[PDB]
Write a protein that holds these residues in place. Structure first.
Motif, PDB file in Angstrom:
ATOM      1  N   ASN A  17     -30.840   0.567   0.145  1.00  0.00           N
ATOM      2  CA  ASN A  17     -29.987   1.726   0.355  1.00  0.00           C
ATOM      3  C   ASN A  17     -30.841   2.973   0.570  1.00  0.00           C
ATOM      4  OD1 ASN A  17     -28.195   3.895   0.217  1.00  0.00           O
ATOM      5  ND2 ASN A  17     -26.926   2.937  -1.362  1.00  0.00           N
ATOM      6  N   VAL A  18     -30.755   3.545   1.766  1.00  0.00           N
ATOM      7  CA  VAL A  18     -31.468   4.777   2.085  1.00  0.00           C
ATOM      8  C   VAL A  18     -30.481   5.836   2.563  1.00  0.00           C
ATOM      9  CG1 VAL A  18     -33.171   5.870   3.585  1.00  0.00           C
ATOM     10  CG2 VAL A  18     -33.599   3.573   2.681  1.00  0.00           C
ATOM     11  N   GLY A  20     -27.673   6.550   1.465  1.00  0.00           N
ATOM     12  CA  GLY A  20     -26.305   6.069   1.436  1.00  0.00           C
ATOM     13  C   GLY A  20     -26.077   4.843   2.298  1.00  0.00           C
ATOM     14  N   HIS A  22     -26.438   1.294   3.250  1.00  0.00           N
ATOM     15  CA  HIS A  22     -26.788  -0.019   2.725  1.00  0.00           C
ATOM     16  C   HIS A  22     -27.375  -0.880   3.834  1.00  0.00           C
ATOM     17  CE1 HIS A  22     -24.232   1.542  -0.358  1.00  0.00           C
ATOM     18  NE2 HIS A  22     -24.192   0.424  -1.059  1.00  0.00           N
TER      19      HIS A  22
ATOM     20  N   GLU C  89     -27.352  12.979  -4.074  1.00  0.00           N
ATOM     21  CA  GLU C  89     -28.496  12.110  -4.315  1.00  0.00           C
ATOM     22  C   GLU C  89     -29.553  12.865  -5.100  1.00  0.00           C
ATOM     23  OE1 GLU C  89     -29.828  10.540  -0.582  1.00  0.00           O
ATOM     24  OE2 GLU C  89     -28.403   8.861  -0.700  1.00  0.00           O
ATOM     25  N   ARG C 103     -27.617   8.296  -7.271  1.00  0.00           N
ATOM     26  CA  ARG C 103     -26.639   8.827  -6.335  1.00  0.00           C
ATOM     27  C   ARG C 103     -25.220   8.637  -6.845  1.00  0.00           C
ATOM     28  NH1 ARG C 103     -29.295   4.856  -3.126  1.00  0.00           N
ATOM     29  NH2 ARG C 103     -29.975   6.524  -1.705  1.00  0.00           N
TER      30      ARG C 103
END
Ligand SMILES: O=S([O-])[O-]
Ligand SMILES: O=S([O-])[O-]
Ligand SMILES: O=S([O-])[O-]
Ligand SMILES: O=S([O-])[O-]
Lengths: 220, 219, 222, 220
Positions: A17-18, A20, A22, C89, C103
């Motif tokens: 996950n980067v 947000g 996936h 985040e 997050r």
């Protein structure tokens, strides 16, 4: 008897996950542990095409692939058949921060990797989200024992489009599954990682790494 | 053209760590093209130093580095004009050091005007308690940053008790002669060592050896 | 520019899944709070992974800036981010190498906020205050809110009070992004914080958390 | 019991070296310690005009000028008449790093400050060397004891042209001259520094600071 064989296979599954987004990426490769060379074919199963630079994932795709000389204790080859696991932090110079875990296990001539990747605070105009990276420059990892745990610190740089460099500072903590595994003394590990080939959206990637251990000047 | 296989080295270094001023003089030699150099140091003021001498050593010239043919030698091509560098040392316990050096050459000898300043070192810290042993071998990463050649090093100090002490260093090199070509990305292997010293570290012998390379698999 | 649809008395529905030092866990939250007074309280409950082998304090700030007293002269980015909602985040950097990322996806439905929270820590020393659970209190801190790279970002200088009168430094950067467009970015302002564990059991399987936050613009007008 | 007057005078002289540029600045002002306010006229005796942003210096131009409540130990006013000294490191987000010292000795009605300042590794096109700073935003200093020494850490920000912000992380160590001065507990100190007026190239600068000590919420 030998747990580590000249030619071994590598099975890997990454879930990440980067910012947000996936993603799920599968790997299947081969390598020569005693030579310190491995190659792998990757294929993102979920979340393709990726919205960030693929390069930030490459080092999360096993130090058992490194040429260790006689005078340096090979911690990673001594960790099998039981295997080991590591944790990593990636601090980039523009605020982006990543953590990563990998649980490595062995069965026959095959390594199995349970890889997790997470990144936050990557700016939209940054070289990662803009996909302006080209490669990781060759690096040198510092191996030493910190709080009874084998730790590795790497100063590292991405080559960007326009002869620019993007700074990333990494710390990895390796921990054998079996007890009584000999911690090594201080040493250096030269690294080299390269994407050999890829399609347009980086849905298919062929990755290759070369790693060598040494004691630095003037021992090397 | 301007640099002989054998050179003489002169270095004047005034400094301040934790409010303690000191003046150190260095007189030694070295062979630039082979990447080696030695130096005798004397604390002419501020002795004995209440802190570990090791933190000063990296301040005590990249012209003494073995550069290959496939890598631009920015330092040897900075002469007879000379160059300068600024440095920042960031230790893991909060101690921060800055340093600068003006390097010149009149004849066959190297002249070094070095300054050093360090703050926020913990009292019981391994520096103010002299618990250090040596600088472990490292690798400097050379790359151009904002038009200026920049060297970054993750170096570690060996302490007493089989423990290591972290230090991140960033150096910015600037040649006096405008037009000296900046090199590409490259690495500089480093090994520094105090060969001999007295009890209170007033007289110290320092030795270095630097080799530049392209990294794997070109090294 | 529109109605926030946030009533003075709100509820909180939280669920955290996380991993620290390889140890997995699942925590659920139920609590109430008042967005206009910048106060909130929550009842946490470790569903899976209990008991936690690490300090509970490192999780507490992960357990919504819609509960902050914002004066009308400072743009309240969070309250006007609703009813659509927002997400954040965060990176937590401790002085001994331990690094956390977290997050939260925040939505509103009627009278209750909903939080899908994730937390991940690595490289904590085995004998550090976290893994040894030697932490006591989050000292009061002040978050610095400002737009960075076109995104509202908050930077704090936090410190955990330890046993033996020692403090544990932590540097945190949070990024805030609204789900709807048209939300106005605020100018530089400060946010005062005070998080406190009011009660818990021995193994911290059930905890009672409380936060009070007040935005301002520093001296002299504060 | 400390002989600190409600209205004090301030004498100051800074010698510094930023980016290889040596300079000398003299300072002369007045202040109200128990109200935490101070003003100062600055003059560049040497190095003028400064090739860098003046704002990076202002934080170095005495914490006795801070309003402390009764429930907080005021370590600074308890350090006089013998005086105290402090050390500081300024770490900017773009690599620029500064050190700073000041020895503060009291001579009756006037505060004397022997200040030193040094800065390295500032990018040529950064907001500092380009002089793109507008002001220091108001911040909060976190005072606490580390290894038997009073220490303050601040997350501060420089407002830039276009209302962008330029991050700076700072740490200060305070040491009283007299032995056994009672250390305070964890407390906060609100800050605001404002350059009230200045000449074309910042050769003459009017500076003002207002500091207030408190113990955070809900005490605020
Ligand atoms: O990067 S290449 O040398 O594998
Ligand atoms: O070369 S030195 O380390 O003996
Ligand atoms: O404190 S001044 O900025 O009004
Ligand atoms: O808000 S008070 O309870 O710290």
């Amino acid at each position: 008897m030998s747990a580590i064989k000249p030619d071994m296979k590598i099975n890997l599954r990454m879930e990440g996950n980067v910012n947000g987004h996936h993603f799920v990426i599968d790997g299947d490769g081969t390598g020569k542990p005693f030579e310190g060379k491995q190659s792998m074919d990757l294929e993102v199963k979920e979340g393709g095409p990726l919205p960030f630079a693929f390069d930030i994932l490459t080092t999360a795709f096993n130090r058992v692939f490194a040429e260790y000389p006689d005078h340096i204790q090979d911690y990673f080859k001594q960790s099998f058949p039981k295997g080991y696991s590591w944790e990593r932090s990636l601090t980039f110079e523009d605020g982006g921060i990543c953590i990563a875990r990998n649980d490595i296990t062995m069965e026959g001539d095959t390594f199995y990797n349970k890889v997790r990747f997470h990144g936050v605070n990557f700016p939209a105009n940054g070289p990662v989200m803009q996909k302006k990276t080209l490669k990781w420059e060759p690096s040198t990892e510092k191996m030493y024992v910190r709080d009874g745990v084998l730790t590795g610190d790497i100063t590292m740089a991405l080559l960007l489009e326009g002869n620019a460099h993007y700074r990333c500072d990494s710390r990895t903590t390796y921990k054998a599954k079996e007890k009584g595994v000999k911690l090594p003394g201080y040493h250096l590990v030269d690294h080299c990682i390269e994407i050999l080939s890829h399609d347009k959206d980086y849905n298919k990637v062929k990755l290759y790494e070369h790693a060598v251990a040494h004691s630095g000047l003037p021992d090397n």
